[PDB]
Amino acid sequence: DRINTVRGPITISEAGFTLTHEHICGSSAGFLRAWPEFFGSRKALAEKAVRGLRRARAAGVRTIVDVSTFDCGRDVSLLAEVSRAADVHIVAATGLWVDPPLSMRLRSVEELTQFFLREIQYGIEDTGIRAGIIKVATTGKATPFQELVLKAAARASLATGVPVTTHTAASQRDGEQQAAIFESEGLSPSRVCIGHSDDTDDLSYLTALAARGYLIGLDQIPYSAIGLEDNASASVLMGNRSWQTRALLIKALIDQGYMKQILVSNDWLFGFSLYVTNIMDVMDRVNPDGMAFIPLRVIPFLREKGVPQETLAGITVTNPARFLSPTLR
Amino acid sequence: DRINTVRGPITISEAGFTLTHEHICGSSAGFLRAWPEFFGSRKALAEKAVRGLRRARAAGVRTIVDVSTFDCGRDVSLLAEVSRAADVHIVAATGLWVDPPLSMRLRSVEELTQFFLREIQYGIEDTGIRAGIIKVATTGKATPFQELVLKAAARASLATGVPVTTHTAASQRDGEQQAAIFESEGLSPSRVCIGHSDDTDDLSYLTALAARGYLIGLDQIPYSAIGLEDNASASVLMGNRSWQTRALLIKALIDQGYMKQILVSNDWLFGFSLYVTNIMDVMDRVNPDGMAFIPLRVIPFLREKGVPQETLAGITVTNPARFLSPTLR
Ligand SMILES: [Co+2]
Ligand SMILES: [Co+2]
């Protein structure tokens, strides 16, 4: 029926063209509040985000999913503010990313489940803003704590119908262990997106997941450190393949007959404190289109390579709606 | 000649009997706001904290220094709220503890100096509340990042006259390396307290630092896991020496001529998310006096051993006043 946004519950039909993996600000918990000058200021960060969202909107984007968790420095009232100013829906996330603090690392699976459910059914902090997605992450084989997080995510999903989205190291085929763990919890693959899947050339790894009912997150399309290979921080972050190479996996998955299982995005941000301090400037130099990269560059590129209009709109409208709309299957 | 508190600057006289290493809540950045139900509720924690402070105040305490940092879950507005309600002065801290998030770990010594100076000179978050102390931490030999934190603290202190206080593993003799770094930065030992120094009975270690002019933090006096031996968390946290063993070190340093270098405290808290879930309950079971433990139990203990009121007054009033009052020397 309805989807939780930072401005309240909306009908599925209001989502329209959705980017399913983005960030307003990728930071750490409390870091934006304690040190806004890292980002110019809170106001300059907010203005920059509103500019970016209005540009993506002019290009046809109606909704983004901010998959920043607690430990990724999600600041939900910032998300609320830029949503209202830009008139772009924003779905906020719960879950845990790859930098949980000690107060999280020491929690049991039952405690974590209570936490994730809190931010979905009760709200995030004291904002009354409720998460419409759960974000989790592994980086290679899951640590014992990550195993907890994945189970807690599956359980929160199973109690609410809110889907799970993942950060992976696709090159190490993380999606296979993630999926094995999600299924052990009785979670339906149709409530799970295996993200960062565009970082691999292995089309078999992808179609198998797709054939199992999972969604495939081809969500870092503009990421490439070509031309700046000596920037270590950009190189680890963006890798060494072209955006066209990343974008061509969309076509490949379509040609295998799995367009229904594809979600595309930019994984873009407007502030970034988690690498070298000017990583955001370096990324903006790589992709001046920001979040409008998908509608402005990827969509025409794919149409030029022969992909039908109906298909590109199914991937950017139908699939996100079917993914976000609350269900157990 | 004034000390910053959460309710504004106070005179030296107003500080009175001061506990120099305490916590309202030991947690992680943003944890209390994201998950207050871990602590019953923010209201239940506040009320416990307020009752706690009123009790300490009835026992003679006028001021506490909350040495919770950003990454130790400092919530300065909670500190401001409980300070007003109980009419106990609270000095807030800057610095970093042992759990810095990625957004902190990637920062340079120059950036860390900037952030610490922000919190001292500009204010904590958007509160306008200024830190009156810098807290740093090592656990054995400093990591590459902890070296940067220590250097940045020395520099911040050097620019403001605001003192530095440390978390140590006393058994690893951390004070010796902390001192060497601090001195290499040209920071006066009179502006530094080497904390958690009561965890060891190594007097040659303590008197060497005390001889250099360092203040010695005997700050976990009520910590003892005697009785609850099989409690995993309580033993690691509190060790196996009785409180009277910890307290005797105070008398030890007095008798070796160092009463002016001694600062005493409980290292007590009213919420704690950094160990097993019910750690606060267990600790309250050990020390039902809370922050009143120092004035109600430790002070009379020393008095019975023949330590004059004049000497006790100097340790609990004069010493904290000389320590907190801004100076480079
Ligand atoms: Co990611
Ligand atoms: Co992301």
Ligand SMILES: [Co+2]
């Ligand atoms: Co400590």
Ligand SMILES: [Co+2]
């Ligand atoms: Co402490």
